[PDB]
């Protein structure tokens, strides 16, 4: 039985100028193709002179020239060898040729987290071999990320675990072995050497993208030896026992490298283990105390917990902070389990490491905490204004619109539209931790995913972040590459709220640099289903403007009048819930 395959462009692609041929694969050997049109779908006018040639199963169709920011159909009937007719199309757009011009210091910033929890694991590890080697990936992949858009990468913990090659990065052993000496049964960290992570800065900076290193400070995990240790009494389990903790670190594959620092005991406030008893617990050590974190009781989270009332732990690490910007040649940091670590040390370390260099460190804290109140209280507590954080708060309408939200509500959702702490909110739509196989705290965003991102990245506040995953191992690059050109040429100047969103609609505007011809854009996303086409009356704030939808998805052309309104349309289905409106010229 006829059916066509697939296609060279694929249904749906935006494409470039420069095509030269749509190859089209049919389930058998084809006899003939009876019509065929190339259709521009603005103008409704067949390009003359098309030609195709049939060989075997595929058909060639060439001898056209595509315009711009043009929408296109190719229709054909074909009959195949056994008299089987199949009638259909494909549709593409095709990319803009001459884009907005934007003074390079006003460049949208947009982040690349560059992991996931299973990389290089099970059939991850087939699909997907490039990735036992992350370094020398991001490395290959600098110059493509660039075009894409991205302004810097976070990536995964680059040091020393305790599970070595299979950690993730998050049982940090070592903070100052990044894949350097032989430490947990491995020179090099699951991810790669220093010397090829040193690379990888070079490739990344050499093409104008920052890197942020995943600092894991609240514990540690695999210790060297254990140590009989008495327990307080106010520990909640066995108070004034004694118990063997493991919390003896020297690091003895790296011998002094970079810092003599060692730990035992007195640099940790408590555990989780008693290797007597072979018990789990809550245990506080003799005479520590706690650290002042924003929540009750919370400084106790999991391994042995740094006790950062410690003065020389307090030093080591300022001075790791130190060498990883100042000599490393990382732009920042994410701070894994922010409220789990001393507010008071966070805001010391943080300003530390800001003040020993001329760069702009950038900071991100990974608080989770789905209440807007709740998390700007803990931006208040740390009190240290360089402090970002990731917006919780606005994944939680995300997963609202799992089964249907209100969509008008996203006018004030997340800490990126409280006032005064807009900027202060780093947006994504799935990590590492919410989008995994195994053992999530949290549901992903497995519906109307591209509408959130579409959200995020055409948003004047914040700073979006692109999942790995999403982007490369879920495949949907084809459908985020034309959000990223949203973001990198249009999404630029003032952005407004409207008056006419509703249950199932919401649109934004970003009316564009007045000194930059051709930019701004006007965002609709639906979780509508209905699966039609719905308009809004929106002021675009560009008078006598044509517009058109860069997403394929609504194949017209929208004219504002002289007061900047226009009627801006969106597909109201899961699949293509969500257009972005840019200028044609
Ligand atoms: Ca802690
Ligand atoms: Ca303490
Ligand atoms: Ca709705
Ligand atoms: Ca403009
Ligand atoms: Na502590």
Partial sequence: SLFLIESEPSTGASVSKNLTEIILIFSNDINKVSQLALTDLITDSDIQGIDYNIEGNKVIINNFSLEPTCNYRLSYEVIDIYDNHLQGYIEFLVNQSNYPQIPDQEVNHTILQAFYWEMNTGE?????PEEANLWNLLA?????????????????????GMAGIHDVGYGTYDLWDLGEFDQKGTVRTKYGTKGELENAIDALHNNDIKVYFDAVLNHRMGADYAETVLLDENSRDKPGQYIKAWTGFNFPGRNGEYSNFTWNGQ??????????????????????????????????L???????????????????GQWIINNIDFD???????????????????????????????????????????????????????????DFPLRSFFVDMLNGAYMADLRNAGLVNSPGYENRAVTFVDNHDTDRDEGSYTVSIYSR?????????????????????????????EGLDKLLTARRYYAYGPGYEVDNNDADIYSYVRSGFPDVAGDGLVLMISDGTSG????????????????????????????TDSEGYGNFKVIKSEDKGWSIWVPVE
Wanted: aromatic content about 18%; proline content about 3%; charged content about 30%.
């Fill in 124 to 128: 991850y590890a087939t699909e997907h």
């Fill in 140 to 160: 290959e992949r600098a110059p493509e990320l660039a075009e894409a858009g991205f302004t810097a990468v976070w990536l995964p913990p680059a040091n020393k």
């Fill in 267 to 300: 640099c940790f406030d408590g555990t989780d283990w008693d290797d007597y008893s072979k018990e789990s617990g809550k245990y506080l050590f003799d005479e520590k105390s706690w650290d002042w974190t924003y929540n009750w009781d919370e400084d106790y």
């Fill in 302 to 320: 999991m391994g042995a917990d740094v006790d950062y009332e410690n003065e020389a732990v307090q030093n080591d690490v300022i001075d790791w």
């Fill in 332 to 390: 920042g940091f994410r701070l894994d389990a922010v409220k789990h670590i001393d507010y008071r040390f966070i805001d010391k370390w943080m300003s530390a490491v800001q003040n020993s260099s001329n760069r702009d460190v950038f900071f991100v804290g990974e608080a989770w905490v789905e209440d807007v109140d709740d998390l700007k209280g803990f931006l208040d507590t740390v009190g240290n204004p360089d402090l970002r954080v990731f």
């Fill in 449 to 477: 995913k591209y509408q959130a991102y579409a959200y995020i990245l055409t948003r004047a506040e914040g700073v979006p972040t692109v999942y790995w995953k999403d982007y490369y191992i879920w495949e949907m690059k």
């Fill in 532 to 559: 039609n086409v719905a308009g809004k009356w929106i002021n675009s704030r560009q008078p006598d403007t044509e517009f058109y939808d860069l997403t394929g998805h609504i194949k017209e052309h929208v004219t």
